[PDB]
Amino acid sequence: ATIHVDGKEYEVNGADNLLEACLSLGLDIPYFCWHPALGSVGACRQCAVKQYQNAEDTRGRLVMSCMTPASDGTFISIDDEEAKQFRESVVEWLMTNHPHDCPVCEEGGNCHLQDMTVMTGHSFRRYRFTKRTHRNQDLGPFISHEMNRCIACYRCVRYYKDYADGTDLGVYGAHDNVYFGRPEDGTLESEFSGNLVEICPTGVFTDKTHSERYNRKWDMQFAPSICQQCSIGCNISPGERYGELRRIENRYNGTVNHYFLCDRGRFGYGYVNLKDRPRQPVQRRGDDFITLNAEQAMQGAADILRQSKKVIGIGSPRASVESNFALRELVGEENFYTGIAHGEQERLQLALKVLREGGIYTPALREIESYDAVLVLGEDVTQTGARVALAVRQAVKGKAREMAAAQKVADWQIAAILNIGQRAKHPLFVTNVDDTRLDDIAAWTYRAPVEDQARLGFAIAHALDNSAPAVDGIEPELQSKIDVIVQALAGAKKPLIISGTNAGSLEVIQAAANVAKALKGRGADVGITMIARSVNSMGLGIMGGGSLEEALTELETGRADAVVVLENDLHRHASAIRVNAALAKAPLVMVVDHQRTAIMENAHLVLSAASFAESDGTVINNEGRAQRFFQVYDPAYYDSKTVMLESWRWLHSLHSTLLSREVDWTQLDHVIDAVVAKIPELAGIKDAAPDATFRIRGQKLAREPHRYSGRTAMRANISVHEPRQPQDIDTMFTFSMEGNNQPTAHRSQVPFAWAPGWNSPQAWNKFQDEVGGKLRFGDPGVRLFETSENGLDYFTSVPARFQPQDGKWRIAPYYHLFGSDELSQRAPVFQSRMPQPYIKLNPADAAKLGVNAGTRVSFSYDGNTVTLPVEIAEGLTAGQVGLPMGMSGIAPVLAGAHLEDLKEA
Amino acid sequence: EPAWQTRDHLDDPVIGELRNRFGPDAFTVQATRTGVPVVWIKREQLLEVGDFLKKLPKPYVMLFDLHGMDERLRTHREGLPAADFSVFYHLISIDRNRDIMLKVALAENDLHVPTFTKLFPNANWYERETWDLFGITFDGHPNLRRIMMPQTWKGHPLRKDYPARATEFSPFELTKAKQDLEMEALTFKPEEWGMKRGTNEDFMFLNLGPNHPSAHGAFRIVLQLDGEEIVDCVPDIGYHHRGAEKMGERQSWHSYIPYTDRIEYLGGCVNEMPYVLAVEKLAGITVPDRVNVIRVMLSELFRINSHLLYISTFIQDVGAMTPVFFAFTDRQKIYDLVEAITGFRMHPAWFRIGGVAHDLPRGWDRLLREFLDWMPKRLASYEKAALQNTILKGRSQGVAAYGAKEALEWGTTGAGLRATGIDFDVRKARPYSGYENFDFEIPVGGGVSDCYTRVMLKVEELRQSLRILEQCLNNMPEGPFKADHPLTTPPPKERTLQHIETLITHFLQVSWGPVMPANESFQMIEATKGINSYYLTSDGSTMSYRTRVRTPSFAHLQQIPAAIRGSLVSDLIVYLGSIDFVMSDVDR
Amino acid sequence: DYTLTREIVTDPLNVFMGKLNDMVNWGRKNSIWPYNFGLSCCYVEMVTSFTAVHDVARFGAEVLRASPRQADLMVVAGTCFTKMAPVIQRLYDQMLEPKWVISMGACANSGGMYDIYSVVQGVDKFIPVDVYIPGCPPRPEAYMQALMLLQESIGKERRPLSWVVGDQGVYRANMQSERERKRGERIAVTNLRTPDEI
Numbered sequence A: 001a002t003i004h005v006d007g008k009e010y011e012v013n014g015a016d017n018l019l020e021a022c023l024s025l026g027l028d029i030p031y032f033c034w035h036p037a038l039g040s041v042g043a044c045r046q047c048a049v050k051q052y053q054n055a056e057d058t059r060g061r062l063v064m065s066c067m068t069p070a071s072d073g074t075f076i077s078i079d080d081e082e083a084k085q086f087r088e089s090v091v092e093w094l095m096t097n098h099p100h101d102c103p104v105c106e107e108g109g110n111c112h113l114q115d116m117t118v119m120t121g122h123s124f125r126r127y128r129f130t131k132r133t134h135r136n137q138d139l140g141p142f143i144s145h146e147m148n149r150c151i152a153c154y155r156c157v158r159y160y161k162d163y164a165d166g167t168d169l170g171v172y173g174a175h176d177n178v179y180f181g182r183p184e185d186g187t188l189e190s191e192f193s194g195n196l197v198e199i200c201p202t203g204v205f206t207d208k209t210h211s212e213r214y215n216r217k218w219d220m221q222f223a224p225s226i227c228q229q230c231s232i233g234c235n236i237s238p239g240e241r242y243g244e245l246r247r248i249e250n251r252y253n254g255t256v257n258h259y260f261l262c263d264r265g266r267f268g269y270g271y272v273n274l275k276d277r278p279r280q281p282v283q284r285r286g287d288d289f290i291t292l293n294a295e296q297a298m299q300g301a302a303d304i305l306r307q308s309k310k311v312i313g314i315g316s317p318r319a320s321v322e323s324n325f326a327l328r329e330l331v332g333e334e335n336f337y338t339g340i341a342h343g344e345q346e347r348l349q350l351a352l353k354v355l356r357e358g359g360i361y362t363p364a365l366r367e368i369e370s371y372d373a374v375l376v377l378g379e380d381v382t383q384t385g386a387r388v389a390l391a392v393r394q395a396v397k398g399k400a401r402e403m404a405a406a407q408k409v410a411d412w413q414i415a416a417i418l419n420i421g422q423r424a425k426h427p428l429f430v431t432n433v434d435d436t437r438l439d440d441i442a443a444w445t446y447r448a449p450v451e452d453q454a455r456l457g458f459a460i461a462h463a464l465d466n467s468a469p470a471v472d473g474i475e476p477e478l479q480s481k482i483d484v485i486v487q488a489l490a491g492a493k494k495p496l497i498i499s500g501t502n503a504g505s506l507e508v509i510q511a512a513a514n515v516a517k518a519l520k521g522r523g524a525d526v527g528i529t530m531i532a533r534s535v536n537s538m539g540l541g542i543m544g545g546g547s548l549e550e551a552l553t554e555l556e557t558g559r560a561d562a563v564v565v566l567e568n569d570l571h572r573h574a575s576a577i578r579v580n581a582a583l584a585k586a587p588l589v590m591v592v593d594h595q596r597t598a599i600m601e602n603a604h605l606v607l608s609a610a611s612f613a614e615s616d617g618t619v620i621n622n623e624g625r626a627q628r629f630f631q632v633y634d635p636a637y638y639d640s641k642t643v644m645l646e647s648w649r650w651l652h653s654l655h656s657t658l659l660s661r662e663v664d665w666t667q668l669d670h671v672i673d674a675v676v677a678k679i680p681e682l683a684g685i686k687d688a689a690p691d692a693t694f695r696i697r698g699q700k701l702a703r704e705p706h707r708y709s710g711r712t713a714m715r716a717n718i719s720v721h722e723p724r725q726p727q728d729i730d731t732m733f734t735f736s737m738e739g740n741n742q743p744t745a746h747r748s749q750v751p752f753a754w755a756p757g758w759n760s761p762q763a764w765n766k767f768q769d770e771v772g773g774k775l776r777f778g779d780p781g782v783r784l785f786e787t788s789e790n791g792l793d794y795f796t797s798v799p800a801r802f803q804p805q806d807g808k809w810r811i812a813p814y815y816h817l818f819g820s821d822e823l824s825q826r827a828p829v830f831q832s833r834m835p836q837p838y839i840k841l842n843p844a845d846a847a848k849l850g851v852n853a854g855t856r857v858s859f860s861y862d863g864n865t866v867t868l869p870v871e872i873a874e875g876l877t878a879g880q881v882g883l884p885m886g887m888s889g890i891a892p893v894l895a896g897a898h899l900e901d902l903k904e905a
Numbered sequence B: 001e002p003a004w005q006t007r008d009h010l011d012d013p014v015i016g017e018l019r020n021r022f023g024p025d026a027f028t029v030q031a032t033r034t035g036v037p038v039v040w041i042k043r044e045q046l047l048e049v050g051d052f053l054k055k056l057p058k059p060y061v062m063l064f065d066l067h068g069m070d071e072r073l074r075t076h077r078e079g080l081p082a083a084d085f086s087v088f089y090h091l092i093s094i095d096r097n098r099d100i101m102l103k104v105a106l107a108e109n110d111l112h113v114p115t116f117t118k119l120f121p122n123a124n125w126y127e128r129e130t131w132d133l134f135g136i137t138f139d140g141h142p143n144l145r146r147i148m149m150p151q152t153w154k155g156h157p158l159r160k161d162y163p164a165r166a167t168e169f170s171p172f173e174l175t176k177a178k179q180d181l182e183m184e185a186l187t188f189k190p191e192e193w194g195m196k197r198g199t200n201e202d203f204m205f206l207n208l209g210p211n212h213p214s215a216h217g218a219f220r221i222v223l224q225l226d227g228e229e230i231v232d233c234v235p236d237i238g239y240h241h242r243g244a245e246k247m248g249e250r251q252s253w254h255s256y257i258p259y260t261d262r263i264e265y266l267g268g269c270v271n272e273m274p275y276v277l278a279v280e281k282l283a284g285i286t287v288p289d290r291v292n293v294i295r296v297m298l299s300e301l302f303r304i305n306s307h308l309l310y311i312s313t314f315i316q317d318v319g320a321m322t323p324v325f326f327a328f329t330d331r332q333k334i335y336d337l338v339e340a341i342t343g344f345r346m347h348p349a350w351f352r353i354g355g356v357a358h359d360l361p362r363g364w365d366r367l368l369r370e371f372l373d374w375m376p377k378r379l380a381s382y383e384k385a386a387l388q389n390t391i392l393k394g395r396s397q398g399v400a401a402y403g404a405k406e407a408l409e410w411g412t413t414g415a416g417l418r419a420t421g422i423d424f425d426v427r428k429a430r431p432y433s434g435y436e437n438f439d440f441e442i443p444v445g446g447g448v449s450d451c452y453t454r455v456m457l458k459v460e461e462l463r464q465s466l467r468i469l470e471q472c473l474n475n476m477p478e479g480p481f482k483a484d485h486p487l488t489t490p491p492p493k494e495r496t497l498q499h500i501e502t503l504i505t506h507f508l509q510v511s512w513g514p515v516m517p518a519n520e521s522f523q524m525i526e527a528t529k530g531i532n533s534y535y536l537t538s539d540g541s542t543m544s545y546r547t548r549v550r551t552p553s554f555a556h557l558q559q560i561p562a563a564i565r566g567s568l569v570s571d572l573i574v575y576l577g578s579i580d581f582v583m584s585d586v587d588r
Numbered sequence C: 001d002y003t004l005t006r007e008i009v010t011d012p013l014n015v016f017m018g019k020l021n022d023m024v025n026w027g028r029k030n031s032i033w034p035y036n037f038g039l040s041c042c043y044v045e046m047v048t049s050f051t052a053v054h055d056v057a058r059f060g061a062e063v064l065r066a067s068p069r070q071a072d073l074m075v076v077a078g079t080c081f082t083k084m085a086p087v088i089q090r091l092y093d094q095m096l097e098p099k100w101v102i103s104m105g106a107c108a109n110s111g112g113m114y115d116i117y118s119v120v121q122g123v124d125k126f127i128p129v130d131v132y133i134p135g136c137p138p139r140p141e142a143y144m145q146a147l148m149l150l151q152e153s154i155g156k157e158r159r160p161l162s163w164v165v166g167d168q169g170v171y172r173a174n175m176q177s178e179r180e181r182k183r184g185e186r187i188a189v190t191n192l193r194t195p196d197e198i
């Protein structure tokens, strides 16, 4: 299409509206109610331009650019005097009731309303009457509410209800008394409620966790990082001030997470700021805990390791690829053990084999929204891979999108699309041990044990393809439900099969692979998604190694007398008594970690490792994409006694001091080169980000904005002499403002979005190739493996149906977005959001045991009689006890296990 | 059409003359807010274009400025030739009362330009500074060495990839540079300084240092002496280099104003005026009449302050030590008024984008009237006691004399230019800030510029500034002290404190900075010591992409060897006293 | 409390030797000859303090020697440019004992507003400073106040009376900070004149 803006010719997409087309061209049109991910509704009336009928037209008329298609031969003017006057008048009308709040408002300096007030040129107030006022609501521990600042742009309700499918936020009242919030005080129930603080263009919805230690956007030190709280790999911009992690902002990745995070990623960062974190190397000498610097810690550890007869290393899926590789190089490949249990390792390696050998394409997180039917087997996605659940909700809305496209409705006219679609949706079928949060939009939900969910998957695969193994013993009603799923999946152009390792069942993953293979054999464009457990579960699976049980066996038999545990608490993957006994038997325990864990009491040496905020590295997400995270700040800048290094730096220096008796702190690119030289399956992590020599016209990439303040005073109380700028030899970023963050700079790692005149998250428009698309020079992160040419065979190991044995209680896993992840559950703001510990019981089982809801019952696992209160689960099948995985005292390895003597305390 | 509007100046006759001489495809005309025709010339035609401009019927006789620009990070270069770097040449025709800027585009690998020194001799130091700060070589330069940074300096600081902030101090490098200072005289060779035919074995080389601090600052002159006579001398400058232009790329448009104050530290609001006028051109702001009169009054008060220091220090340098005490008492009366108005003495930082920081306090007219009553008797007393003494006259008359041609070829401005009979003052030739509404005269010399004629011309300039101050006192308009423009930074404080849209504008202006749309602006003023100019390039951001400050003291110090050759050292110190320079102006 | 240059020690101070030390300190603090050294605009304010309207001669500190050998006080009045830092160090080394240093203005104190590639961030990076003056520039009476502060510091220091007999260490008094001394009167301020008047 061809448009003429202010007498200048432009080539645009005709299927776009004029606002997103002009913003993609670099032109500035003020806007409030439009969002790239939410569509156009034409509410705020801010985006007025003057449209002319033809070239020889001087009158024109004011139109909404967001509601006007960018059709071929379209003549508009942005800088027309009447259009500018009307846009200024719209800002002025918004300003009549706006509170005098910018100094005490958390949005200030990051506020889209401030930016558009300045952009329209409105700075003189002639309104003299009263301003309307609203009372605020309590919205829970994450979101702070201030309705005075609302401009009634309806972005919050459109995102929360129409996009995120939330139910507890709405708009109330009428005329100028419209109110946006909950129907009563309470916590916002959506797992994606935290995106309101970026969706809202004003300071109505703000980050309460950031508000506690508030600082302005210009004062932040930003880095591009990867969220560490699950396996999805959403791109984040952590921002630090005064040595503490202050905020997690969304970093736009047009391939993975685009505009949105989940609440665990956004608000679960508080473990970085915990005061009990190790900051120096500490050696246990008898009952004394002496503090070492880096060099003598390396020398003492190297001497003791040299005296040892066999050193084993226990990695973790929390640690990066480089850290796990450095531990593997320190101890040797045959002495390296993954820190996860044997069953978890089997499930993770099966998921990896399905992903990189199954011949079925695995989609990125944005690509999930383009699928026409979804079958989720076993994986409680909202509690384990939440952003996948949000993308699945978008894929469900795809049917209304297609129906509206059949009626020649433009794809941005979202209200017309929703009106045409009504309650029609693409088919979604979820299976779990109980109800999920996707049940509101799912075409069907199967509440069954993991064996029965696997049998349902195998039956679906057999009915799709007769070469798949059959299932004997399916009831006719379950058969009818299976047939419903089969005709929904067979008639889909793009079916998607989602599973993962969190169900605790190998057979669930096998059944999902069988369904995907059966759909691939019929010629469908089938995709498969595997949800892993942790941020680098897939990287640890690719690297490989022995299980934690084998490492504990080596420690117990005395074959290994030295153990180096990297970033692993070891209690989530094995019983605490066995771990404690094996670690007490070992004459040397060294723990390299950034969190004070329970195994540090028996540790002979503790190395103060860096968390993700203080370290660089690579993590492989659930789709196999290698992504680099960069260090946010120097931990030694304020506290000069802090010796907190990257885990790979500690382990490389330990290996060098063990070999040549000399220290070697090395560089990140050297470790990455060693990884890609030694492990060819991880060769793609080299191209996840450019090396430390990368420059934009000779200059590095700035971590902090150009208006960063307090350089000669932030450390003045410690010393009036300003310290040296922290040097970054590892990456291409600099720990200063003296660098490049231009939106036109040829790079893919953007620490934060800022453009002149766009101080809010709307500056990501300037950083994109087209608005709502990808980053201008490509989204960061590369895929490790391509889709294989040939697939796997059908898995013939169809399990038998679940049978409740008397006196034995099968543990059904229950996951929680707030509580199941280890580091995020250590965050203090999550404790209020955390559910109270519980045990779920069937009504028949609770009546048989003579217990009601709330009564405290006790059970013994690995010789630990623990007591929990009972709540009644309607959807749980009898013979099962529902336990909250990943919580304190309940390890995630308990999923699929069995319970004895479960009786009332 | 407002005076700040973007113009290509295609109606200028110089554009038609260049088109007739070189053809239409030889050059590219750029539309700017500089007020001058900006013409992009190919590198291979630069000397031809310069010679053609020098041989015009009303010729361009002065190279006003010559410097560089790192264009690699510039995103808004629409209509501009492809360029990693560029070199600009600002030339002035006084007879036409016109000026032209020539721009040469350069690729990153081919960073060399033909030298301009055969056409204009002040291009020597201008090209040395361009080589020092940008790394652009000039082929045919007689000695292209660093002039700001020391010779053992790595990198070119005005490049966009050079870090602006101070590096970590090291006592070892201080010890090493102290050793270089200690054996500098022992290993002195005239060849690296451009000197020649020294050690003949009759000349001596003698270094001057920081031993006579007459408020001008620290710099060195190495003199080649035949006995007592100067046969050659080069000034060693850069000892007062503050990186002010680099700081212009480091501060917002609003927060750079205190740095403008310290370019020529005896000038104050005089230094502030060209910067805020150039920013207001970028913003499209026309200030009201009260702002113009207030800014003129502050500029003339500081001009009298600077002239008082200059005249008294000249008298002290001649040998009469008494009038400096009384002249600094007069400076204190000026400071009484300036402290009352702006809150500060020497660096008020009081001008604003769109106006001034506050309204005039009640009772300013009383202090201005007191100073205007105090000054003339004191000035007459200084004249009779010192400037009419025949020993001072015998020390200053005929010392370091030059004519109009020497003043034009070296870029000499201010009283040194007007003592040669050329009537060129910016406040009359290119009026700014409402100076055309004031009745004042421009004193000019008889044709010959000595130390004495320069000093007496500055005395008459002081009297004319007193006349302007009297007019400012008698007719001060009623109205606003800030413009009614959205880019007035900051907005009026009372509306900021009670109106939300004004508070929003203030919030974003003081924190992120005012957004100046992408343009180039220029403002030239008659400063206290000559012609001072700001050339600002905005890339559409809240900071300057390029802040180029042309200062007259740079040109005067470069003129020093041509004027003092064949004289004695006493003539040199009297000449330095009569130049009216400060080293901050020279080195920026 | 005293600091020793040859550590934090106590007061080393017969009653005749104390009177001689007081007489020497009185003569030194009442005859302070500054070195005529001009770096930047702060030096303009210093020489303004030398003129008739301030008359720093009243304190006996107007002599303004051009040789570092005849000067007792170095006033770093201006920016410590990187090219000028060896010059400042050499001129300070050429001064003879006893010598005192006043860092004048924000540039000499810390680098001031010039956190830039060509400026040393404070003269105390390489030479010791007795009195610091904030300001950009400090007004001439601020320089006079710093001169009086230096006089108070000199009046209670301990230096050897002769280089052949006695302790040769230089003892400088650990004076109370001016901020802490003036905090009582400064915090008690309630109202100031409004800035709309002269």
Ligand code: SF4
Pocket: A098, A099, A100, A101, A102, A105, A106, A107, A108, A109, A111, A112, A113, A114, A149, A201, A202, A203, A204, B504
């Ligand atoms: S929402 Fe924006 S405009 Fe309103 S008070 Fe907050 S920062 Fe100011």
Ligand code: SF4
Pocket: A149, A150, A151, A152, A153, A154, A155, A156, A157, A180, A199, A200, A201, A202, A204, A205
């Ligand atoms: S609360 Fe925020 S997002 Fe919702 S209508 Fe008001 S300004 Fe818009």
Ligand code: SF4
Pocket: A227, A228, A229, A230, A231, A232, A233, A234, A261, A262, A263, A264, A265, A266, A385, A386, A387, A388
């Ligand atoms: S979905 Fe996972 S990776 Fe993404 S923000 Fe949530 S916890 Fe982080």
Ligand code: SF4
Pocket: B262, B265, C040, C041, C042, C043, C077, C078, C079, C104, C105, C106, C107, C108, C112, C135, C136, C137, C138
């Ligand atoms: S502190 Fe201020 S007045 Fe003093 S030398 Fe530095 S810039 Fe000049």
Ligand code: FES
Pocket: A019, A030, A031, A032, A033, A034, A041, A042, A043, A044, A045, A046, A047, A064, A065, A066, A067
């Ligand atoms: S953005 Fe178009 S009317 Fe709101």
Ligand SMILES: [Ca+2]
Pocket: A614, A615, A616, A631, A728, A730, A731
């Ligand atoms: Ca690092």
